[PDB]
Structure formats: structure tokens, C-alpha cells
Motif scaffolding. Structure first.
Motif, short mmCIF file in Angstrom:
data_model
loop_
_atom_site.label_atom_id
_atom_site.label_comp_id
_atom_site.label_asym_id
_atom_site.label_seq_id
_atom_site.Cartn_x
_atom_site.Cartn_y
_atom_site.Cartn_z
N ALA B 39 0.77 -1.23 0.00
CA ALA B 39 0.00 0.00 0.00
C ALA B 39 0.81 1.30 0.00
CB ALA B 39 -0.92 -0.02 1.21
N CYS B 40 1.73 1.47 -0.96
CA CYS B 40 2.52 2.68 -0.94
C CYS B 40 1.67 3.94 -1.11
CB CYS B 40 3.59 2.64 -2.02
SG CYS B 40 4.73 1.22 -1.88
N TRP B 41 2.10 4.99 -0.38
CA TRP B 41 1.31 6.18 -0.25
C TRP B 41 1.31 6.93 -1.56
CZ3 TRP B 41 2.21 8.63 5.36
CH2 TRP B 41 1.60 7.78 6.25
N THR B 42 2.39 6.74 -2.33
CA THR B 42 2.55 7.27 -3.67
C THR B 42 2.54 5.99 -4.49
OG1 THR B 42 3.87 9.08 -2.82
CG2 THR B 42 4.21 8.58 -5.16
N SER B 43 1.44 5.81 -5.24
CA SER B 43 1.19 4.61 -6.01
C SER B 43 2.15 4.46 -7.14
CB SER B 43 -0.24 4.64 -6.52
OG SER B 43 -1.13 4.63 -5.40
N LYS B 44 2.52 3.21 -7.36
CA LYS B 44 3.41 2.84 -8.44
C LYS B 44 2.72 3.18 -9.78
CE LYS B 44 2.77 0.12 -5.17
NZ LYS B 44 1.58 0.97 -5.16
N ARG B 45 3.54 3.41 -10.79
CA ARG B 45 3.13 3.63 -12.14
C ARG B 45 3.09 2.24 -12.77
NH1 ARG B 45 1.76 9.19 -13.40
NH2 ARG B 45 1.68 8.14 -15.45
N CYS B 46 2.33 2.10 -13.85
CA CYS B 46 2.11 0.82 -14.47
C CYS B 46 1.57 1.07 -15.87
CB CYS B 46 1.10 0.02 -13.65
SG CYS B 46 -0.46 0.93 -13.45
N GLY B 47 1.32 0.00 -16.61
CA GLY B 47 0.68 0.04 -17.92
C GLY B 47 1.50 0.72 -18.98
N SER B 48 0.82 1.25 -19.98
CA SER B 48 1.43 1.90 -21.12
C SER B 48 2.27 3.13 -20.77
CB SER B 48 0.30 2.25 -22.12
OG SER B 48 -0.89 2.73 -21.52
N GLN B 49 1.82 3.79 -19.70
CA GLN B 49 2.51 4.96 -19.19
C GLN B 49 3.84 4.57 -18.57
OE1 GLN B 49 -0.71 4.34 -18.62
NE2 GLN B 49 -1.93 6.13 -19.14
N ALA B 50 3.99 3.35 -18.06
CA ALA B 50 5.23 2.95 -17.43
C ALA B 50 5.92 1.76 -18.07
CB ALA B 50 4.94 2.68 -15.99
N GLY B 51 5.98 1.73 -19.39
CA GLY B 51 6.74 0.75 -20.14
C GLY B 51 6.22 -0.68 -20.11
N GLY B 52 4.93 -0.85 -19.89
CA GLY B 52 4.38 -2.18 -19.86
C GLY B 52 4.46 -2.81 -18.48
N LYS B 53 4.95 -2.10 -17.45
CA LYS B 53 5.12 -2.55 -16.07
C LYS B 53 3.84 -2.95 -15.34
CE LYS B 53 6.84 0.44 -12.07
NZ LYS B 53 7.16 1.85 -11.99
N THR B 54 3.86 -4.07 -14.60
CA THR B 54 2.75 -4.57 -13.82
C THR B 54 2.81 -4.02 -12.42
OG1 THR B 54 4.05 -6.66 -13.69
CG2 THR B 54 1.88 -6.73 -14.78
N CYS B 55 1.67 -4.02 -11.72
CA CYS B 55 1.58 -3.59 -10.36
C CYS B 55 2.02 -4.70 -9.44
CB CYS B 55 0.15 -3.23 -10.04
SG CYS B 55 -0.23 -1.74 -10.98
N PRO B 56 2.86 -4.49 -8.41
CA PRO B 56 3.02 -5.43 -7.29
C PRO B 56 1.70 -5.77 -6.62
CG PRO B 56 3.96 -3.30 -6.73
CD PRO B 56 3.79 -3.36 -8.26
N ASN B 57 1.73 -6.92 -5.91
CA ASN B 57 0.69 -7.39 -5.03
C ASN B 57 -0.66 -7.47 -5.74
OD1 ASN B 57 2.62 -5.32 -3.67
ND2 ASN B 57 1.86 -6.37 -1.80
N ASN B 58 -0.65 -7.71 -7.02
CA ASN B 58 -1.88 -7.99 -7.80
C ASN B 58 -2.91 -6.87 -7.78
OD1 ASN B 58 -1.56 -10.75 -8.92
ND2 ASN B 58 -1.83 -11.52 -6.88
N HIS B 59 -2.36 -5.69 -7.73
CA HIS B 59 -3.15 -4.49 -7.68
C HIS B 59 -3.50 -4.19 -9.12
CE1 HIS B 59 -1.74 -3.76 -3.52
NE2 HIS B 59 -1.29 -2.56 -3.74
N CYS B 60 -4.65 -3.53 -9.35
CA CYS B 60 -5.04 -3.13 -10.70
C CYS B 60 -4.32 -1.86 -11.08
CB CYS B 60 -6.58 -2.83 -10.80
SG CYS B 60 -7.68 -4.17 -10.32
N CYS B 61 -4.06 -1.78 -12.37
CA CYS B 61 -3.49 -0.66 -13.07
C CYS B 61 -4.62 0.09 -13.80
CB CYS B 61 -2.52 -1.14 -14.09
SG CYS B 61 -1.58 0.13 -14.90
N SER B 62 -4.85 1.33 -13.39
CA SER B 62 -5.85 2.21 -13.96
C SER B 62 -5.50 2.68 -15.35
CB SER B 62 -6.00 3.40 -13.06
OG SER B 62 -4.84 4.26 -13.10
#
Lengths: 171, 171
Positions: B39-62
Motif C-alpha cells: 500500500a505505498c502512499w505514492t502509487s506505483k506507475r504501471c501500464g502503457s505509461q510505465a513501459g508495460g510494467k505490472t503492479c506489485p501485489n496484484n493491484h489493478c493498473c488504472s
């Protein structure tokens, strides 16, 4: 870098299975017999059928009380995990806490991100560093999080150790 | 016991935050600056915006490329994680693989549990354990999984090491 009981509850990344010996991989020796978490071949029990046990790795709990992902699990009747139905909490739901330390929005729904954990967050992992203790009107933290000596809510040795004022203080 | 970089990508239970130093807990010292996952207070980047990167801990990418849970994350526009819309895969989706080792059912959807990982499972963490290698027509595993010398697919030293016939071997 050990998982399960050997690794203190630690979960593998990307659903890799934690074997009975506490290591991470994929294949019959890890996901097979004695799988502790991750994509175990025999899905873990959860929900009302497993005494309110939560699914590891943020998996959805189906209504038959089995952990997984996809429509059978996260869809209709889902009892916990990232259920496709919105999950109520907070004042709006009688003070109910979000499961898995999820933040309860001001509007009364469980999630994670600034929309849930930011301004107005009612419980769980809120980003608002709300002060607790003798310095802050005697107020205790939510989710039985420890109120540290310096009056911040959290979990870990720094919060729950020496000078813990309330919460899950170590004894 | 250690999480993040320090515990080889290992994740904490119940969305606890992995601090910059490799320990699990909740509060600004774990969830604030340097939070590696959870639960980082500043959420990780993911998806197309972040080079195809997945979210830790099976979190959804908006749709905006940030990790979390709830309608804004898992609902409309979700590009990763347990999205509320069914994710397709397999021969139906041009041989696509499910994200985060999820099983692609024979019907072409991504999930986890017998319905997805059982008979017909096309790729990801299938419980079926189809043989690979020299023994088995020369069949290779899905997902660059290592086919071991005994003709099983998986990830880990017993699979990817000595006598690894195909997949991401080390040899």
C-alpha cells in the motif's frame, strides 16, 4: 527471500507459488502438494467456509470459499479480495473496516490509491499522517495499528515497540 | 523475511508496505518515501505509461497508469491486474498470455482456480502438468517456463538448471 511460514508471511511476486519448504518458483514442486501461497494447484479455502480466513496474494474468495481470480471468483457472490462489486465500509457501513488493510474512502468504499487513502480516508492504510495519543486528544489509531511514542500510527517495531501508547503494542 | 530488492522481489502479506530498507510494516516509515511495494502512499506507475510494467501485489493498473484497488482502478479503463472486465487470452486472443502467471482457460479468459488452471488451460500456471522436452514430442513449455531434465515445466533451480531442455534455462 523465503516465503510463507519460513519467510514470515511473505508472498512471491507475480503469483509464483511458495513451496512447503518456503521457496518461490513454478511447477509441481512448488504449486503442488504443501503450496503455502501464490497460484497453488489446490486453491486455498476462504470466507465463511474457512472461518473468515482471507485469501493470500489479494486473490478473490468465491462464494464456495475457494481463492482465485476471474469471474467465478471475483464476480457474483465474491466474499473478499478485489471483488468486482464495490465493498462498503466506514460510517456509511456501520464502522466496518476494509479487509486486507484497504482504505475506506470518505464515500464509504474500499480501495487503494489517492482516491481512497487520501483526504477523508476512514480506516486502513490512509496516507493522511493523522496524529494519535496523548499529544492528539487521546485518540487511538484505526485497525488496531500501533500509536508510536512520537504519535503516528503504524505497524512494525518502531510503532509497536518502546513507547507504544495504544494499538497492537508489543507487551 | 526481507521484502523488495532486499528479499528478491518478495511481497508483504495484507498489503503491508515494503520500506526502502527491505522490512514490512505500515506507517510513514514503510509506506512513505522509498516504499517498494504494498500500500505505498505514492502509487506505483504501471501500464502503457510505465513501459508495460505490472503492479506489485496484484493491484489493478488504472487507465492513467497508477496502481491500486476500487472502481477507479479496477473498473473502466483498467489495463492490468484483476480488472473487473474479463481479460482474454490464448488461441482466441492471438495466443496472448495472461499477465502475472494467470491461467488462460480453454475458453480464452484469464483467471486462477480449477476453472482456469484445469483441463484446457492454455498458458500460465496450469495444474495439468503436461510433459515437455525430448520425452514429450519436443513440446516446449508456455511462458518461457523451464522444461527440466525430467520433462516438467517450472521456474526454479530444479527446473532451470542442469539439464534444462528449453525455456529460460541456465545452461
Amino acid at each position: 527471500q523465503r516465503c510463507g511460514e519460513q519467510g514470515s508471511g511473505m508472498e512471491c511476486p507475480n503469483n509464483l507459488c511458495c513451496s512447503q519448504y518456503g521457496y518461490c518458483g513454478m511447477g509441481g514442486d512448488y504449486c503442488g502438494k504443501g503450496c503455502q501461497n501464490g497460484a497453488c494447484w489446490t486453491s486455498k479455502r476462504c470466507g465463511s467456509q474457512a472461518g473468515g480466513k482471507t485469501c493470500p496474494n489479494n486473490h478473490c474468495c468465491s462464494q464456495y470459499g475457494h481463492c482465485g481470480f476471474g469471474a467465478e471468483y471475483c464476480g457474483a457472490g465474491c466474499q473478499g479480495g478485489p471483488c468486482r462489486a464495490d465493498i462498503k465500509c466506514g460510517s456509511q457501513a456501520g464502522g466496518k473496516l476494509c479487509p486486507n488493510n484497504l482504505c475506506c474512502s470518505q464515500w464509504g468504499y474500499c480501495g487503494l490509491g489517492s482516491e481512497f487513502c487520501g483526504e477523508g480516508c476512514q480506516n486502513g492504510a490512509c496516507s493522511t499522517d493523522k496524529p494519535c495519543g496523548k499529544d492528539a486528544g487521546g485518540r487511538v489509531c484505526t485497525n488496531n495499528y500501533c500509536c508510536s511514542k512520537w504519535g503516528s500510527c503504524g505497524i512494525g517495531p518502531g510503532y509497536c515497540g518502546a513507547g507504544c501508547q495504544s494499538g497492537g503494542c508489543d507487551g
